[PDB]
Each structure stands twice: as structure tokens, then as C-alpha cells.
Write an enzyme that holds these catalytic residues in place. Structure first.
Site, PDB file in Angstrom:
ATOM      1  N   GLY B  30       0.803  -1.197   0.000  1.00  0.00           N
ATOM      2  CA  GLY B  30       0.000   0.000   0.000  1.00  0.00           C
ATOM      3  C   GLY B  30       0.848   1.263   0.000  1.00  0.00           C
ATOM      4  O   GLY B  30       2.006   1.276   0.409  1.00  0.00           O
ATOM      5  N   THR B  31       0.241   2.332  -0.512  1.00  0.00           N
ATOM      6  CA  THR B  31       0.816   3.658  -0.368  1.00  0.00           C
ATOM      7  C   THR B  31       1.044   3.964   1.097  1.00  0.00           C
ATOM      8  O   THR B  31       0.208   3.670   1.953  1.00  0.00           O
ATOM      9  CB  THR B  31      -0.112   4.720  -0.956  1.00  0.00           C
ATOM     10  N   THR B  32       2.190   4.552   1.384  1.00  0.00           N
ATOM     11  CA  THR B  32       2.456   5.023   2.723  1.00  0.00           C
ATOM     12  C   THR B  32       1.346   5.961   3.173  1.00  0.00           C
ATOM     13  O   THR B  32       0.868   6.808   2.413  1.00  0.00           O
ATOM     14  CB  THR B  32       3.812   5.716   2.798  1.00  0.00           C
ATOM     15  N   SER B  75      -3.717   1.248   3.989  1.00  0.00           N
ATOM     16  CA  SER B  75      -2.829   0.894   2.899  1.00  0.00           C
ATOM     17  C   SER B  75      -3.099  -0.540   2.491  1.00  0.00           C
ATOM     18  O   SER B  75      -3.084  -1.455   3.320  1.00  0.00           O
ATOM     19  CB  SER B  75      -1.368   1.066   3.271  1.00  0.00           C
ATOM     20  N   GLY B 162       1.407   1.442   4.788  1.00  0.00           N
ATOM     21  CA  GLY B 162       1.975   1.645   3.474  1.00  0.00           C
ATOM     22  C   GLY B 162       3.451   1.308   3.451  1.00  0.00           C
ATOM     23  O   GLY B 162       3.987   0.634   4.331  1.00  0.00           O
TER      24      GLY B 162
END
Lengths: 233, 244, 243, 144, 241, 52, 242
Positions: B30-32, B75, B162
Site C-alpha cells: 500500500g501507499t504510505t 494501505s 503503506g
């Protein structure tokens, strides 16, 4: 290996990935190309109608779920038809229930988790079509893109199926042009016409192959095919 | 043997679900994104990855609210969280329906994980690809949790999910030590934006947008709302200076 | 076939490996814990391990207060932990609701015991990798210790410990109990019982504990409960006084 | 036949086989003028190649033999037919209509199988069904 | 609960199960049916694998679905009974519903989907039974003979056999019957039948079992002697040369 | 005619020689385009020969 | 093995593609939509003498204004047919009028995916896709005549002419050749009729093939063996000139 990890949408890759998705993701680009864009005024769809033979008809990639809302597809039509019908309900439903137009935003919300259920639920599969969706509303014209991953996005413009990048790059290149083309569907359109020409590769867009739709401020979702695409050809 | 990895509900000889672990793969994938339990409230911050011009900025907004007092960010699969978000968005009104009260974050919490834990309980019930930072001001103060596809969450004075967490993990742990006192949401607002950029630096490669929200018993008045506009720009400029 | 380990079905030996592996998940948390019936009370102590600052450490317990009367300690993953207590939570009021008086501790155990045996027998159902010990001071049975397994197997205890180092405290108390020869710690102040325990937990674990080190709870007549770090500290202080 | 990329050099006698492959590769790489001289490798499997083989500057283009098709069979047939005495009122187009796409060699099982049908039907020029039956027969009797 | 699809297009686009169903049908002892001009005759072999059976309470292969509608089949004697029932049920329904018993087709077409169900029905296998359907429609004297198969497919037959060695006897009948000249007499049809039976039955009387439907629920199963009459009758015609 | 980035974006994730596969095709396709000059089209036809 | 809904790496469904296998197996079925009508012809493909070619029907009427044909495993259609027949009436029952063959077509196509075992997103109960693809002829006021290839894909098109089944491909090229807008039904008849006889394994007679048309006046109309044999011989005359 993957046949271990790919076979089940319920089953992550060792990297935590669902190849069926990735597979469905493959059928995406497998699908015919089609293009969409929006101004703040209008939101335009531009589709490549593929046929089987000339004897056959040309598969239409664009759908009207609603006056303010209609969409285009690439990948598996049957899924979308449901979804569209499913969606068609929603705007209906809303405007039924609330007399409220479904937010193109709120629309994109729906299919996502709806798609998400296709994902997390064993025994089933994702849908085989990603969607370009133009809609106009109280918040204006909105072009949204969906992914059989469930993932949705509003774009000023976009294209999908095969090699959409050419248009896409050009569109992403074209960006501020059309979004500022306002109350001028035509150049909003012809931008796509140029756009789709960018990702036109095999041949040129035709009366039969080119499909076009626009929703806009006072432009309801409105599809243009054939002679309707003829002038923009 | 093997295949223990394959089916969710399976206990591997170690007594473990590798799918969940594989879910975690997608999770860190996941995105941070971070969240901060601050003094009155909590603050939620996440990098918004800008993949292109055609992206209409500020439209796609990762953090979702439950009730009005529960902010949430995750995330993993955006569909997963949203799926669970509504799943949460249910329980509150549900709870609130029965109990007339909007649900306590902790109350609200355990609901989710159990539900999530279900997604462990069967080899087919593919757990969620998301871990989720969530919380807010509730009957007593803020709360901030981050929940694992395992079904593990806890109380987190700050939390990050993330990729770039570790950039944040310190940063939070810093402000833990920088501010064992506490922190104004607005400074958490400010701090996070940095931390995110810092967290972003793990992902630094591409352009990104920054979603930050928060639940401040002070400012949102026990509600969750989004860091927006100038204080947002502030925190940015704050951060974007401090990133230098 | 070899799935017999992947699933619950009699091994060629009539064995259930997931079960046996669920047993792995039990100490997979690596929390050692104890249950001691005091004279009046029952007392349960456990390792409170706070690996992180970012934690709200307060939030961390595997000892769960089931009822008015009944609490329980979990040995196992907090998702599975958080589950069974919930599961347990129902039966009590349920039992009480149905039966007009609160559920006796073991009943819950026997109850919860039934549960895994299901999943044990129910293939798609996985059993849970938590070991659970229920305690209360039972209106009938007074101080009570009932530990259950991932296997739905359970029994009453004069006292018990559980965790990776369970055997050690097990020996310790077994030593001390074979020493003391009575099922319960004979102390009127559960404090002492706690202090006894924390001793013998510190003892067999060979491990000094801060107040943040210990998950500590006490089953008392009509009320199971736990302690703050301060009663723990009080004990830490109190136990530091005996020694 | 020479083997491609393989661990089979671990046996110790296949080294020579590889050494020959080595020889070739070693040899073929530099000093074959490949503007004039053409380097082409027929194989069942494109993957088996010794990694040295497919390297650019050694094998640039990599082609599959295109399977003889409805048309190809016809003409591949037609030629197979010319040795036989065959009916020309019928078409190898007509036969290859019936046949799925198969190897340019097997297309005699189409054609040369009816040298008997030529003398089975006692049509010195073997007729359509002669080879249709052949396509029937050989594919019928095929079952592999 | 059990949905598991047992019938799947294989890579070739085929259901082996379907294909194996026929195998049990092939395994199924032969059964034939043939229409006289006025009549339909159903020959069937008894599986001779055993004896000491009470043949009375030993179930006959051909079975009446309706007074004017009987059926023969090849495959699991189990699969039939169900099919037998629902068919029997069906007509009675058709009777009650339509104020009229079925046509044979309709019944046939009825039972068609039944197999056809389990084909595209998961959680099940199709039947191990292909059938032959004999009956003369209400107010129809005309011989009606309908072959069916677990694939859910069926048709009309100048004559038909099924079961082990069906082709053998079929190949026999395929010539041995004339479309233009049905063995109009029951006997000659039956005899032609018995002829076709000894093709496969390999010289048996008990083991042969005949069924003949005439118009208007007129139906007969012959005693082995009556059979053996034709059996013996045929034998001479052979031994004459 | 060459524009790499178009090629480079239309081609995707080539270990180098696949670009050269595109490229040698392009050169090939340059004569197949009749040119000794090797152009974007040559290379887009180096793309066109299936790059997967 | 593998799930049936399992996407191919291509994002395709094996079974579908395998369903596509059984499709070609079918008797080659051909149809041509004229503005006079829609000609239909198919291979009886009688597999045994005692088989009476009569009981063979790969061509069916859904309605006067809608009737169609099957090539593939003819079992699956039965439902679909009646199902198709259903909605038409049903539409009419509701709409007092004929359904757009297309609408019907589209509707029936929707049957496609309705195989599944506990699928994700809806309950679609069948073990597998449909073992048959269908030529759909129809006349509707709006579109005049209409011709369609119903496909287990659920996708379909409106074919100026269409051939399906075994030898349909070259026939399709034949149609592709043979077809023009101005085709007369009787042309297309003999066209198909030849193209059949052309592509037909068995030499075309009335018994080894079947003919039908759909006509804005008469709607779906099947041709007897006789007029078949008539047009058949008519070919032989017309087929042999030069």
C-alpha cells in the site's frame, strides 16, 4: 506456481497479488480501444467499435446508464451490461428514491466495493471490463475510469483497451486543451478524435468503428455513432 | 508440507496463515499513510500518488469517514478498505441506531477486526489486502488504531501504514519523544505533512498529492474532518520547508 | 490425502495437525501467564510485553473479563483472542438471561470447549490457536481455574500457568503445591495471592517484572477483575518487601 | 538433437556434445559472415536454445515454422499429389478445406494415402472422397 | 450445498462424464426398439450375468410410463427408475394438466431436459442411461420410437437399439429394416427384432425380452417361447442354407 | 522519424535487446519500409511485430 | 483442476474457449439476412440410416417474427429456446407487441454466464457455459429483418449473413463473398443452399440439410424437404452452367 497463486481470486500471490485480477486486467488491454474526456462543461466518450466481420455488426463500447450518466467499456461487455444495468438502477434508484441524480462520484464508489466483492469472495471472479464513465452533475461534467481491480478514478480525459497510451500520452499531453474546451463538445470531441487517432494504430476511425458519446452540462449523456461520428471522423 | 500458504484458514505447521502474511505483502505494498493520535484528537495523513496529468487532483480521496467522528485510512486494496469502510460505516449507525449514541472508536474498532478476522476463518474468505489506520474523538477523547488483515489493531498514539511507514515510524516515534506532552492537531497536521513527504521519500520516485485529515476534539469538535486549505498548505509549506 | 495436515481429518494415526499446529499458534504470541486460585480468590498473572512506544500499551491484554464473575486469560493471537472472549461474552448473559443466574466458569469452558471440537470436527471451520483459561470465584465452586485448548479439551486446575515457559511455572507451582499440598494458595488477601504469584511467576520465570511487564488479574467472589499497573506496582513493591 | 541449454553436462560425456555446441557457438559467433551466409536452426522447441544461441548478433530473428494451413495444405497437397496420379477436377483446396492445419509432411497422409485410393477407387486420378476418405481415414485411424 | 460441477467442457470442449455416461450405456446390456408399420417392438437382452433370480420379481428392462407409453433404456437400472418415475409422473401430470396424456415426443422432450439438466447441472452427474421410448400418441396409432441419451439428446427412429453391441444389432437392422417397408406385422417386426437380438443376445430365449406397443395403449411383452418361436423360426431360415 | 519515448512508452519494460528486437525489426522493417533509413514507423513496426 | 470462472492469463475463460470448441463441432449452420427476409440453412448431419432426419431440428421458431437456429450441443438451447420464446411472449404479454429480436437476442445472450458455483457478485447456477451457439434470425419493424449469431460468449452481432458450425469459416468467406446488400432471399437461399452443399460433408439433399426463412410478412418460415429438394435441384441446374 502461479497456477497455485493465480487460480484463486481469494488467493494472494506470495507477493500478495491476485493474478485473476491481473488476468482480468489483461483482458482489459485485450479489449478494443476507446477514449473519453471531460471538460468541466462536458464529458465526452470516444469509442472504437470493433466488429467480428464486416458481415457482423460493430461491438459498441459505450453505455448510457442515465441522462447525466453513461459510460464506455473495454474488456468483457457482459460484465458491464450487468453493471450498467446495475448502475442504471442506481441513478434511477436515487432519482427514484431521492429524486436525486446519482453522483458520478458516488457512482464510482459503488462498483468499486461491488467489484471488491468479486475479489475477496472465493468461488467467484472479478469483472472482465474496466470502464470509462462520463457524467455531468451538480458538480459538473465528470469522466471517471474504473478498474476491474475495483479501482476508480475521475480523469479529465482517458482511453482504454488496446494501446490507449497513444491517445493517453497525447491526451495527458493534450491535458489543458480540452478541459478548457468548454461548451465546445466538438473540439472536446475532436480532441478525442485526435486522441483516438493517437491510439489509432491498425486503421483509421470510421463511421462504423468510431463511436462517440458526450454528457455535459446541458448535454445529457448522448452517444454519437456512424453519421453522428461521420462529421467528426 | 506446503499449500499451507495457499488456503487462508489453514494453519501452517508453524500455526500461521501465509495468505494473511501475503495479505500483509499487499498491505505494505500500500501507499504510505500515517495517522496521529494528538492531544484532543487524532490526525490522519496519506500520500496521494499522482500518476499523471489526467488525474484530477483532490478528487480521489483515500481517507474515509465513519459516522462523522471516525476518520479512517488504510494501505492496501482501496476496494478492500472502502468495502470495510462501509462495513464500518454500517456498524456505527447500527450501533448508534441501537445505542442512540455514535459508536466509541474502541467499540467501533473490535467490530471491524472480528469482521476482518472472519476473512481469516476460511481458506476462501481471502482476508483484506489492507491494514487500516483509523480512529477519532469519541465519548472519551480521541482514539487511533491501525488494524491488520490478521485482525490485529491496537491503540496507537501514532500509526503509519503503506511502504514509507519506516520513514514515518521514526518521525512519529520522534514526535512521541518530541512531544510526549501531546500535540496540537495542527502541529500533528504540520508534522505529518513532513513525515508523509519523508514517508513519501520511500516512494519518492513519482509525483504525489497529499491527503491529510484529522479528528480534533478541539477543532472538529469531536469530529473527523479533512486537513484542508491553508493549514493544509501551511503544514505542507511547514513540511516542504522542513523537508529541506 | 496429505491434506490431513492441511485440514482437520484423522491422520493415518487419527491425528489432527492443524490442531497440533493450532497448538503452535498458542505460544506463537510467546506470552507466559498463570492462573492461581487464592484461598478466597483466583488470581491470574501474565506477561505484559510492550515492544513499541507507538503502542498504546494500556490496550494490550490477553486476560479478559468475561462476566461479572468470570474473567479469562487468552494464550494466543489477539484476533483469535478478541474472538473467543466475544464468543464467551455472549454465553454469560445468555446463560444468565436463559438461566436466571450467571454462568459458572467451567460451564463457559465446557461451552467454549464444545466450540473448537466443532471446528476440530468441522473441516472448513478452523479451530482457534488460542489457549484460554477461565477463572472466577464461583458462587458454587468459589475460586475457579478452567483452562481450555484449541482442541476443546479443558479441565479444572488447583492453579495453572500458561505460556512458552508454562512448564517452568508449572513445575514451580507443582513444586510449591506439592509443597503446599493444598489446591489453592491459602491467603485471604488476594494481594498476597498476587504477591505469592508474582513471586512464583518471577520465581519460575526467573524474571523480574515491571508493572508494565505484567498482565495481572484477579477473580474474586462475584467479581473477576484485574489491576492497574499500580496494584501491580503495589505488588512489585509488596513483593519487593518479602524479598 | 545436439541439445540446447541443459544441465546435462553434469553427466560428463555430454560436455563433448556441449563442446560441439560450444565449438559451433564459439565458432559461429564471430567468423560467420551473416550478411551473406544464413544461420538458421530448425527445432521443435524455441526455448531449449543454449543461451549463447539466441543472443543478439548470433540469433537476431527468431521464427516459428508457420503451420501449413487450409491453403498451404492445398498446395502442399497439390505437390504431394503430383507424384501420385490424382484427380484435378477435385481441388487440394477442396481437401484442405476438410483438413485442420497439420505439418507439411503429413499432408501426404492426405495425398499419398490415396495412391491406394487411386487404385482402391481404381481412379488412376484419385478423386475427392479418395483423399477425403484419406483425411477421414488417416485422421480417423489417427487417434493419438 | 453440493454444487460442484461434475460436467465441464474439457479443453477439447467436452464432458468426459457425458462421454463416460455412454460407456455405462455401452456397458448397458443391449436394448433395441423397432417400429412395425402399425406397431413398435422393443427387444431387449436380459443381462445374463446371473440366474436363480425369480424373474417375476426380477425387474423387466422395458417399462411402461403410460398405458400407451413405455420405455426401454441402457445403463444403470438405478438411473432409469427415477427417470421412469418422473416420466410416469409427467404423463399423469400431462394427463391431469392437459386433460390428456403426453405425446411420446413431449414426454421424450420432457425427459430430454432431465438428462440435459444434469449435464449443465453442477453437483450431479448425468444419468448413466440412454433410453428408447415407445408409445403411440393418444388418438395416434402411429409407431413412435425415440432414442435418448444422458447428454439430453433424442430423436425419432425407424428402429433403434442401444446398449452393448448396439451397433452390431443396429448394423444388422440398419440394413435388416427398410424405411419404406416396416415389418408391418408385429411378428415380422418382432421376428426381425428377435433376429436382431440373436445378433447380440447370442442365442437366448429368457435373456431376450420383447416389448411391442400397438395403437391406443395396446402393448405386449412376449414370453420367451413366443420369443423362442421366432428364435427357432429364424434359426431354420438360417439353417435352410 | 524515430521518437524513442513514444517507442519507449509504447514498448514496455524491454530487457535491452527487445528494444533491439524492435530495432533490428525496425532496420529490417526499414528495408521492409524500403528505407535504408530506420524510422519511428520502422521502430513502431519494430513495436508492431508483437512485443507482447 | 481449475475454476471455470478462472480467467485465462489472457483474461479469458478456458471453458468459454472450450465452449467455443464444441461450437465448431456443430453442424455447419448458415443464415443470411436479406431485406427480403433472413434465409437460414443448416446441416442435418444424419449419423445413421435408421435415424429419421425429421426428428433432427437445429432450426427453431421463437416467434413468427423471431425464429433461429442452433449449432453446438443442441441440448443447452432447449431452455434458451423456450427461455427465448418466453420473453417474446412475455414482452408481448407485457407489451402487447413483438420484442425487438435484438432485445430478445440481447436478453437471451444474458443467459451466457449463468453457469457458476457460488460465484462472486450473484448466484448464476449452471455447471458450465452453453454447448451451442445460435444463429438468430428475426424481423422487427424497427430494424426490418435481423440476423444474429448468439454465442456462449454472450456476445453476438448482427450479421449481414452468418455461418456457424463445422465448415462455417470458408462458408463465411463464401458468405463474405456471396453476401451483398441487394441479395434476394432466393439467391441467399441457393447461396446458402449451395454454400451448404459446398461446405457440406454429405451431398446436400432435403433430408441431410434444412432450410427456413423469416419474412416481415410471414415471419419465420421453415422450408420443407420438397421446396428444399426443389431449390436443391435448382442449384444443380444453376450450380452447373459455367
Amino acid at each position: 506456481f502461479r497456477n497455485n497463486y493465480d487460480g484463486d481470486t481469494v488467493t494472494f500471490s506470495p507477493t500478495g497479488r491476485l493474478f485473476q485480477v491481473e488476468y482480468a486486467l489483461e483482458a482489459i488491454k485485450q479489449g478494443s480501444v476507446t477514449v473519453g474526456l471531460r471538460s468541466n462543461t462536458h464529458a465526452v466518450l470516444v469509442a472504437l467499435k470493433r466488429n467480428a466481420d464486416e458481415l457482423s455488426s460493430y461491438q459498441k463500447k459505450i453505455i448510457k446508464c442515465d441522462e447525466h450518466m453513461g459510460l464506455s467499456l473495454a474488456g468483457l461487455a457482459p460484465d458491464a451490461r450487468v453493471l450498467s444495468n446495475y448502475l442504471r438502477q442506481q441513478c434511477n434508484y436515487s432519482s427514484l428514491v431521492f429524486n436525486r441524480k446519482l453522483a458520478v462520484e458516488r457512482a464510482g464508489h459503488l462498483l468499486c466495493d461491488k467489484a471488491q466483492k468479486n475479489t475477496q469472495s472465493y468461488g467467484g471472479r472479478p469483472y472482465g471490463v474496466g470502464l470509462l464513465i462520463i457524467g455531468y452533475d451538480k458538480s459538473g461534467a465528470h469522466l471517471l475510469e474504473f478498474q476491474p481491480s475495483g479501482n476508480v478514478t475521475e480523469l479529465y480525459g482517458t482511453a482504454i483497451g488496446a494501446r490507449s497510451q497513444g491517445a493517453k500520452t497525447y491526451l495527458e499531453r493534450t491535458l489543458d486543451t480540452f478541459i478548457k474546451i468548454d461548451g465546445n463538445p466538438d473540439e472536446l470531441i475532436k480532441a478525442g478524435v485526435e486522441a483516438i487517432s493517437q491510439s489509432l494504430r491498425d486503421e483509421s476511425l470510421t463511421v462504423d468503428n468510431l463511436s462517440i458519446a458526450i454528457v455535459g452540462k446541458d448535454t445529457p449523456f448522448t452517444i454519437y455513432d456512424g453519421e453522428a461520428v461521420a462529421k467528426y471522423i | 508440507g506446503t499449500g499451507y500458504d495457499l488456503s487462508n484458514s489453514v494453519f501452517s505447521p508453524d500455526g500461521r496463515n501465509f495468505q494473511v502474511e501475503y495479505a500483509v505483502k499487499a498491505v505494505e505494498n500500500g501507499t504510505t499513510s500515517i495517522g496521529i493520535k494528538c492531544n484532543d484528537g487524532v490526525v490522519f495523513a496519506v500520500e496521494k500518488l499522482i500518476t499523471s496529468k489526467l488525474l484530477v487532483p483532490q478528487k480521489n480521496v483515500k481517507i474515509q469517514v465513519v459516522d462523522r467522528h471516525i476518520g479512517c485510512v488504510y494501505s492496501g486494496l482501496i476496494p478492500d478498505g472502502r468495502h470495510l469502510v462501509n462495513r464500518g460505516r454500517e456498524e456505527a449507525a447500527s450501533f448508534k441506531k441501537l445505542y442512540k449514541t455514535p459508536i466509541p472508536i474502541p467499540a467501533f474498532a473490535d467490530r471491524l477486526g472480528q469482521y476482518v478476522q472472519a476473512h481469516t476463518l476460511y481458506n476462501s474468505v481471502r482476508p483484506f489486502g489492507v491494514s487500516t489506520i483509523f480512529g477519532g474523538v469519541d465519548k472519551n477523547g480521541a482514539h487511533l488504531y491501525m488494524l491488520e488483515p490478521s485482525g490485529s489493531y491496537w491503540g496507537y498514539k501514532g500509526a503509519a501504514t503503506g511502504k514509507g511507514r519506516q520513514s514515518a515510524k521514526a518521525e512519529l516515534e520522534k514526535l512521541v519523544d518530541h512531544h510526549p506532552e501531546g500535540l496540537s492537531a495542527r502541529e500533528a497536521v504540520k508534522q505529518a505533512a513532513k513525515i508523509i513527504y519523508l514517508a513519501h521519500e520511500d516512494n519518492k520516485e513519482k509525483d504525489f498529492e497529499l491527503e491529510i485529515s484529522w479528528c480534533s476534539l478541539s477543532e472538529t469538535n469531536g469530529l473527523h474532518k479533512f486537513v484542508k486549505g491553508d493549514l493544509l498548505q501551511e503544514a505542507i509549506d511547514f513540511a516542504q520547508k522542513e523537508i529541506n | 490425502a496429505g491434506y490431513d495436515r492441511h485440514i482437520t481429518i484423522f491422520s493415518p494415526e487419527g491425528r489432527l495437525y492443524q490442531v497440533e499446529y493450532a497448538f503452535k499458534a498458542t505460544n506463537q504470541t510467546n506470552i507466559n501467564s498463570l492462573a492461581v486460585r487464592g484461598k478466597d480468590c483466583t488470581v491470574v498473572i501474565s506477561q505484559k510485553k510492550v515492544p513499541d512506544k507507538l503502542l498504546d500499551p494500556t490496550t494490550v491484554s490477553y486476560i479478559f473479563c468475561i462476566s461479572r464473575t468470570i474473567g479469562m486469560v487468552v494464550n494466543g493471537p489477539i484476533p483469535d483472542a478478541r474472538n473467543a472472549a466475544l464468543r464467551a461474552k455472549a454465553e454469560a448473559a445468555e446463560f444468565r438471561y436463559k438461566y436466571g443466574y450467571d454462568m459458572p466458569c467451567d460451564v463457559l469452558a465446557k461451552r467454549m470447549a464444545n466450540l473448537s471440537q466443532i471446528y476440530t470436527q468441522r473441516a472448513y471451520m478452523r479451530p482457534l490457536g488460542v489457549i484460554l483459561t477461565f477463572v472466577s470465584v464461583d458462587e458454587e465452586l468459589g475460586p475457579s481455574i478452567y483452562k481450555t485448548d484449541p482442541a476443546g479439551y479443558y479441565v479444572g486446575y488447583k492453579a495453572t500457568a500458561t505460556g512458552p515457559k508454562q512448564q517452568e511455572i508449572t513445575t514451580n507451582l507443582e513444586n510449591h503445591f506439592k509443597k503446599s499440598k493444598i489446591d489453592h494458595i491459602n491467603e485471604e488477601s488476594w494481594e498476597k495471592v498476587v504477591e505469592f504469584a508474582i513471586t512464583h511467576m518471577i520465581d519460575a520465570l526467573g524474571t523480574e517484572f515491571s508493572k508494565n511487564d505484567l498482565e495481572v488479574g484477579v477473580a474474586t467472589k462475584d467479581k473477576f477483575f484485574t489491576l492497574s499497573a499500580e496494584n501491580i506496582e503495589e505488588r512489585l513493591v509488596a513483593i519487593a518487601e518479602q524479598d | 538433437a545436439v541439445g540446447g541449454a541443459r544441465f546435462d553436462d553434469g553427466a560428463g560425456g555430454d560436455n563433448e556434445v556441449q563442446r560441439t555446441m560450444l565449438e559451433l557457438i564459439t565458432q559461429l559467433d564471430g567468423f560467420d559472415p551473416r550478411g551473406n551466409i544464413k544461420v538458421m536452426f530448425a527445432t521443435n522447441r524455441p526455448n531449449t536454445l543454449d543461451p549463447a544461441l539466441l543472443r543478439p548478433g548470433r540469433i537476431d530473428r527468431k521464427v516459428e515454422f508457420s503451420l501449413p494451413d487450409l491453403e498451404g495444405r492445398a498446395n502442399i497437397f497439390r505437390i504431394h499429389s503430383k507424384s501420385m496420379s490424382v484427380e484435378r477436377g477435385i481441388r487440394w483446396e477442396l481437401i484442405s478445406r476438410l483438413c485442420p492445419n497439420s505439418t507439411g509432411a503429413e499432408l501426404r497422409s492426405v495425398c499419398t494415402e490415396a495412391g491406394m485410393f487411386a487404385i482402391r477407387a481404381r481412379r488412376k486420378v484419385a478423386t475427392e472422397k479418395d483423399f477425403l476418405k484419406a483425411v477421414d481415414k488417416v485422421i480417423s485411424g489417427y487417434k493419438k | 450445498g453440493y454444487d460442484r460441477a461434475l460436467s465441464i467442457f474439457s479443453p477439447d470442449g467436452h464432458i468426459f462424464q457425458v462421454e463416460y455416461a455412454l460407456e455405462a450405456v455401452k456397458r448397458g446390456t443391449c436394448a433395441v426398439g423397432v417400429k412395425g408399420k402399425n406397431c413398435v417392438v422393443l427387444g431387449c437382452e436380459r443381462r445374463s450375468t446371473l440366474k436363480l433370480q425369480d424373474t417375476r420379481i426380477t425387474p423387466s428392462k422395458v417399462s411402461k410410463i403410460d398405458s400407451h407409453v413405455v420405455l426401454s433404456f441402457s445403463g444403470l437400472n438405478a438411473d432409469s427408475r427415477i427417470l421412469i418415475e418422473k416420466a410416469r409422473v409427467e404423463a399423469q401430470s400431462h394427463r391431469l394438466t392437459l386433460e390428456d396424456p403426453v405425446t411420446v415426443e413431449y414426454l421424450t422432450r420432457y425427459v430430454a431436459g432431465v438428462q440435459q439438466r444434469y449435464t449443465q447441472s453442477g453437483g450431479v452427474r448425468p444419468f448413466g442411461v440412454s433410453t428408447l421410448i415407445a408409445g403411440f400418441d393418444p388418438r395416434d396409432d402411429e409407431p413412435k420410437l425415440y432414442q435418448t441419451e444422458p447428454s439430453g439428446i433424442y430423436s425419432s427412429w425407424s428402429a433403434q437399439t442401444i446398449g452393448r453391441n448396439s451397433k452390431t444389432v443396429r448394423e444388422f437392422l440398419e440394413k435388416n429394416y427398410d424405411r419404406k417397408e416396416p415389418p408391418a406385422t408385429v411378428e415380422e417386426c418382432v421376428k426381425l427384432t428377435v433376429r436382431s437380438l440373436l445378433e447380440v443376445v447370442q442365442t437366448g430365449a429368457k435373456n431376450i425380452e420383447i416389448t411391442v406397443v400397438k395403437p391406443d395403449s395396446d402393448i405386449v411383452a412376449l414370453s420367451s417361447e413366443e420369443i423362442n418361436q421366432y428364435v427357432t423360426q429364424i434359426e431354420q431360415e438360417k439353417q435352410e442354407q | 522519424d524515430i521518437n524513442w519515448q513514444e517507442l519507449a512508452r509504447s514498448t514496455d519494460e524491454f530487457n535491452g535487446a527487445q528494444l533491439k528486437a524492435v530495432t533490428v525489426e525496425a532496420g529490417m522493417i526499414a528495408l521492409r519500409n524500403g528505407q535504408s533509413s530506420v524510422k519511428h514507423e520502422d521502430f513502431v513496426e519494430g513495436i508492431s511485430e508483437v512485443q507482447a | 483442476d481449475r475454476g471455470v470462472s478462472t480467467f485465462s492469463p489472457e483474461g479469458r475463460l478456458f471453458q468459454v474457449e472450450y465452449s467455443l470448441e464444441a461450437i465448431k463441432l456443430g453442424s455447419t449452420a448458415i443464415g443470411i439476412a436479406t431485406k427480403e427476409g433472413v434465409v437460414l440453412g443448416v446441416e442435418k448431419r444424419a449419423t445413421s440410416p435408421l435415424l429419421e432426419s425429421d426428428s433432427i431440428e437445429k432450426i427453431v421458431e421463437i416467434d413468427r417474427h423471431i425464429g433461429c437456429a442452433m449449432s453446438g450441443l443442441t441440448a443447452d438451447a432447449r431452455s434458451m429456446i423456450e427461455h427465448a420464446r418466453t420473453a417474446a411472449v412475455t414482452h408481448n404479454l407485457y407489451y402487447d407487441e413483438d420484442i425487438n429480436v435484438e432485445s430478445l437476442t440481447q436478453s437471451v445472450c444474458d443467459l451466457a454466464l449463468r453457469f457458476g458455483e457460488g460465484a462472486s457478485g450473484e448466484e448464476r447456477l449452471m455447471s458450465r457455459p452453453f454447448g451451442v451457439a445460435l444463429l438468430i434470425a428475426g424481423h422487427d419493424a424497427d430494424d426490418g429483418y435481423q440476423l444474429f449469431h448468439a454465442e456462449p460468449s454472450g456476445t453476438f452481432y448482427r450479421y449481414n449473413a452468418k455461418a456457424i458450425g463445422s465448415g462455417s469459416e470458408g462458408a463465411q468467406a463464401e458468405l463474405l463473398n456471396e453476401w451483398h446488400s441487394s441479395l434476394t432471399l432466393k439467391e441467399a437461399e441457393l447461396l446458402v443452399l449451395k454454400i451448404l452443399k459446398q461446405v457440406m460433408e454429405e451431398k446436400l439433399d432435403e433430408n441431410n440439410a434444412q432450410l427456413s426463412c423469416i419474412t416481415k410478412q410471414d415471419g419465420f418460415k421453415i422450408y420443407d424437404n420438397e421446396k428444399t429438394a426443389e431449390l436443391i435441384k435448382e442449384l444443380k441446374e444453376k450450380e452447373a452452367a459455367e
